[PDB]
């Protein structure tokens, strides 16, 4: 699932998924959004968002009986609409994008088996053995997590996109009226190599 | 406050604003944001969505020892993908519109002592003093929600649109929140959407969802 919103001068975006291969992932994935919306809407950054989605479905899953058997990936950005500036934080394989200069770029990176072996020194691992999730809101002890190091500057027109790959063709935008919808998409997915025909996307664009 | 996703089978939207008459609204509208997005997010109806935040703010009011004196007023809509089937919740002087035919057609009916007295069988109360919210989330006893009863169908284009205007609104900095389809064309809608008759202020906060 999706959401963008604004509250607290920031506008922010958050993509969720279910572990597929677990116990119960969309409501451990509901449990992540609502977290994350909640803090974002009150001020919060996406980092907070992250943590704050953890606590909460490590909590319910315990509460369970099925901790590390349940969980969701995720991604959120915030844009701070006072200064114009980016945070965004990831877990999992859902991907973070900065929209600048008229180009998307990768932000965050992914946690998997691959990237954890190319980081190790060993190479990339192909395949579905590669694609297996290392970190996931709702793992035991989460201590991998992608993030902004700083907040990112930018400039009206540029922005964000968080993506997770019915809800097919389907998007959520925070926008301003002088910002035109026509246009930045257009780009985007002129870019929109990036993302498959399937992805659920959420942006927004200062 | 707005926003707007996608769980389950549905695309929603939702507006939220604490009553800045009162005390402490941003705090209202918060709990009343994130109770009414949980909900949604996990497929439930707008009333339903409105029922949590209700109970979300009543309880963290109630706590504060403050429960009647802070509040915030809402509207929230969601579109059925598989169907393509409509519905909406509101209370206080939040707005839900029609997207059909080019147009914006009012939905949804204000709480407000005008219209409570014509909801009576009596005559309007204009201006300022006809405007006090007899209906907000967070009041002692919500009674009064209104609400879409049969869910409208709705084609690919059309769509729902929720405002929040209000005089009485914290002063924020915001962006439009809106739901939509490859398919649709962003920029194009919201012009489409508004021409010189947008039936709301040029500081309202927008959430829309388009099928």
Same mark, same amino acid.
Request: hydrophobic letters at 45%; a negative charge.
């Given at each position: 699932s999706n959401a963008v919103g604004t509250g607290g001068d920031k506008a922010y975006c958050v993509v969720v998924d279910g572990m +597929? +291969?677990? %116990?119960r992932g969309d409501e451990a994935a509901q449990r992540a959004l609502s977290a994350s919306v909640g803090v974002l809407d009150a001020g919060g950054s996406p980092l907070d968002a992250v943590l704050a989605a953890q606590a909460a479905v490590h909590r319910w899953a315990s509460q369970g009986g099925i901790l590390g058997r349940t969980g969701a990936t995720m991604a959120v950005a915030a844009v701070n609409l006072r200064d114009g500036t980016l945070e965004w934080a990831s877990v999992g394989d859902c991907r973070v994008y900065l929209f600048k200069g008229g180009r998307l770029s990768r932000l965050s990176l992914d946690h998997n088996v691959s990237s954890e072996m190319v980081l190790l020194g060993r190479g990339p691992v192909p395949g579905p053995a590669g694609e297996m %999730?290392?970190?996931? *809101?709702? *793992?035991?002890?989460?201590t991998e997590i992608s993030t902004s190091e700083a907040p990112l500057p930018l400039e009206a027109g540029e922005g964000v996109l968080v993506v997770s790959d019915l809800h097919e063709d389907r998007i959520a935008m925070a926008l301003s009226r002088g910002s035109d919808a026509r246009g930045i998409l257009q780009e985007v997915e002129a870019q929109?190599?990036?993302?498959?025909?399937n992805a659920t996307l959420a942006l927004v664009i200062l």
């Amino acid at each position: 699932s999706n959401a963008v919103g604004t509250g607290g001068d920031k506008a922010y975006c958050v993509v969720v998924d279910g572990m +597929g +291969g677990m %116990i119960r992932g969309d409501e451990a994935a509901q449990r992540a959004l609502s977290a994350s919306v909640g803090v974002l809407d009150a001020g919060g950054s996406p980092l907070d968002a992250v943590l704050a989605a953890q606590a909460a479905v490590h909590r319910w899953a315990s509460q369970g009986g099925i901790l590390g058997r349940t969980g969701a990936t995720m991604a959120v950005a915030a844009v701070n609409l006072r200064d114009g500036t980016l945070e965004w934080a990831s877990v999992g394989d859902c991907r973070v994008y900065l929209f600048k200069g008229g180009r998307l770029s990768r932000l965050s990176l992914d946690h998997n088996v691959s990237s954890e072996m190319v980081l190790l020194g060993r190479g990339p691992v192909p395949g579905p053995a590669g694609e297996m %999730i290392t970190s996931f *809101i709702g *793992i035991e002890n989460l201590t991998e997590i992608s993030t902004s190091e700083a907040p990112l500057p930018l400039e009206a027109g540029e922005g964000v996109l968080v993506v997770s790959d019915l809800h097919e063709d389907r998007i959520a935008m925070a926008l301003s009226r002088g910002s035109d919808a026509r246009g930045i998409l257009q780009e985007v997915e002129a870019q929109g190599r990036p993302y498959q025909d399937n992805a659920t996307l959420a942006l927004v664009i200062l």
